[PDB]
Design a protein around this ligand. Sequence first.
Ligand SMILES: CC(=O)N[C@H]1[C@H]([C@H](O)[C@H](O)CO)OC(C(=O)O)=C[C@@H]1O
Ligand SMILES: *[C@@H]1O[C@H](CO)[C@@H](O)[C@H](O)[C@H]1NC(C)=O
Ligand SMILES: *[C@@H]1O[C@H](CO)[C@@H](O)[C@H](O)[C@H]1NC(C)=O
Ligand SMILES: *[C@@H]1O[C@H](CO)[C@@H](O)[C@H](O)[C@H]1NC(C)=O
Ligand SMILES: *[C@@H]1O[C@H](CO)[C@@H](O)[C@H](O)[C@H]1NC(C)=O
Ligand SMILES: *[C@@H]1O[C@H](CO)[C@@H](O)[C@H](O)[C@H]1NC(C)=O
Length: 620
Amino acid sequence: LAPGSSRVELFKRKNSTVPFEESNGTIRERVVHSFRIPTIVNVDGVMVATADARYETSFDNSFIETAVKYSVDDGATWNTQIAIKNSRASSVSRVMDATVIVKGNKLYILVGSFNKTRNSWTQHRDGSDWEPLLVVGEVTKSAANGKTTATISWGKPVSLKPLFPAEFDGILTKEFVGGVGAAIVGSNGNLVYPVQIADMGGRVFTKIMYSEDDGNTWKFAEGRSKFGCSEPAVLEWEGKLIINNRVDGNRRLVYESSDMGKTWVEALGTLSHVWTNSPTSNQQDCQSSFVAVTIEGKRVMLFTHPLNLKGRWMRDRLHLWMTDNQRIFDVGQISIGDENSGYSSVLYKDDKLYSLHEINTNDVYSLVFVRFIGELQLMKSVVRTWKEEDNHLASICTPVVPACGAAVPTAGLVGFLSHSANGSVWEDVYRCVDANVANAERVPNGLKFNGVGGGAVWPVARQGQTRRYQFANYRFTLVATVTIDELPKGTSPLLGAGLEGPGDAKLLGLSYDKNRQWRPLYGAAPASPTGSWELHKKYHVVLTMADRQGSVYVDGQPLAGSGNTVVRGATLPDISHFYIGGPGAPTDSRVTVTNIVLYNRRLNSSEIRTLFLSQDMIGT
Ligand SMILES: CC(=O)N[C@H]1[C@H]([C@H](O)[C@H](O)CO)OC(C(=O)O)=C[C@@H]1O
Ligand SMILES: *[C@@H]1O[C@H](CO)[C@@H](O)[C@H](O)[C@H]1NC(C)=O
Ligand SMILES: *[C@@H]1O[C@H](CO)[C@@H](O)[C@H](O)[C@H]1NC(C)=O
Ligand SMILES: *[C@@H]1O[C@H](CO)[C@@H](O)[C@H](O)[C@H]1NC(C)=O
Ligand SMILES: *[C@@H]1O[C@H](CO)[C@@H](O)[C@H](O)[C@H]1NC(C)=O
Ligand SMILES: *[C@@H]1O[C@H](CO)[C@@H](O)[C@H](O)[C@H]1NC(C)=O
């Protein structure tokens, strides 16, 4: 966990007590084997932590009730209750998997309820022992002489089953549950719940169940995920709802929707497929928290997920990520060493960052309450860097084009390599994904390469487990200022996006040859000379790839062949990295490149001219 940060075993396995109330009223303090499925929120000043209180064993299909522990002193002190009771219909009756919403001084909890099944939910024969329960709680935060206090009265639970269609587009429905963890209140005031639906047969999938009348009605919105998507999380971004899904056996799928879920678009230019369940991505996946907060004047999203280096359900190394839907920063591990963590929750309150997440030892589970001093600190530092640079760049008077000129483009400006560097790392100005460097010597705002393999590699698939530049495969705009320093024996590489796989494939890219012509590479079509360039002279290159199409620009003008289809078929390309210069063959590209900019969209033509018109102004 960050140096400075700390934690406390808030819901301690086999130690902590919950007031279990017997059939006939008596209430007894009772030990609880494992506490799993945490969520901690902030109802009007009073901290609320909800969880599965699994009395006898950690297994899903045993006896479970929803416990809370709220507080009015930022964790100094804590009270404990049992928010929802199970039916008590057998020795496995349970309510679980709370998905929580907070509006005003009310808490709307949504849990799955089962009576006697001993197998898990997707494999049930019908939905007859399952019920979707809605429960509301109200925080009453009265005080007393320099000492606030508070109560939470919980209401009888209400079943949502009569409002669940038997059919979705002809998909027979079996059962549903909320996504797990915190959901939200829409900026339009709706109560929105991401929910996971199992059909008759075990296919699972995701949807938005919302309320525009504070709890009284619920509507199942038109759109859905792909099959294999479960435990969705949700937040609102620039008028849109963004739904991050858990995906067993594959990479995490992300969808955006602008109509409260009526239509879903897969977020291929931003967050989809970036995150995953294990280095090899074929393991069971794991719940995540995905929360919109404002830090240092700026709205970012916050995302938690373990690396699972150990695999299966160990869920070691919980991580924390922060993104503005453009850049993605890895804050670090919020958990200690090789401990096995699990489902987590993050909460920003009165300028303090916190977490409530699982720890697992021999499958007996605890919930730790963590204080993110370190992380927050680091988080502000980079939000400061994003604002700081966005604004700078957005404040450069670029030249007026014969019709101050249009702004330097910063929207979806993902990364940028300028002046800061050394012999083996060109650093990202937006502090997220640096460049790996070789045989280079510094020049203002960039590197002059010279030597076998001199160039730089901006990891794309080579990034590894988490793939933060996953976007390039859908669209990108790669920009750079260059000169050719020495003529090439034949043809050498200048700037590109090269393909994972055997051989030496490139998606789109540009090279120069012995004749002083440019050789743009458009997918697998063979390079063919075009134009003229003059050693030493400064050129503005921009490579552009969208709609499976590519274009290359020199001096704001597109070279011949631009627009050529660059990849065939439905699968997205798997870009390995972007190359600057000439990072098998002993490639010695003798060039100097400076100020490389990266965008998650296809900049436009006037946008490209803005950059061409202002490249001697963007540098750090
Ligand atoms: C209803 C239920 O089974 N809940 C469990 C869920 C589910 O089992 C699985 O995601 C696929 O059905 O999994 C997990 C889990 O740590 O993986 C915890 C949940 O409590
Ligand atoms: C519960 O754990 C606490 C934390 O250290 C400790 O004080 C105490 O020994 C434990 N009580 C039990 C049930 O043994
Ligand atoms: C309620 O149930 C418990 C369970 O053993 C019993 O001992 C308790 O005193 C009961 N209360 C009454 C008044 O029966
Ligand atoms: C489950 O059991 C309870 C307790 O008797 C019953 O009233 C409830 O309605 C049952 N319904 C389901 C979800 O099968
Ligand atoms: C080079 O600089 C980067 C950050 O600028 C740093 O991570 C690296 O360790 C430095 N030194 C080496 C060995 O390249
Ligand atoms: C180019 O895009 C910029 C910003 O996204 C915008 O100002 C301008 O209207 C666009 N021009 C075209 C060609 O649509």
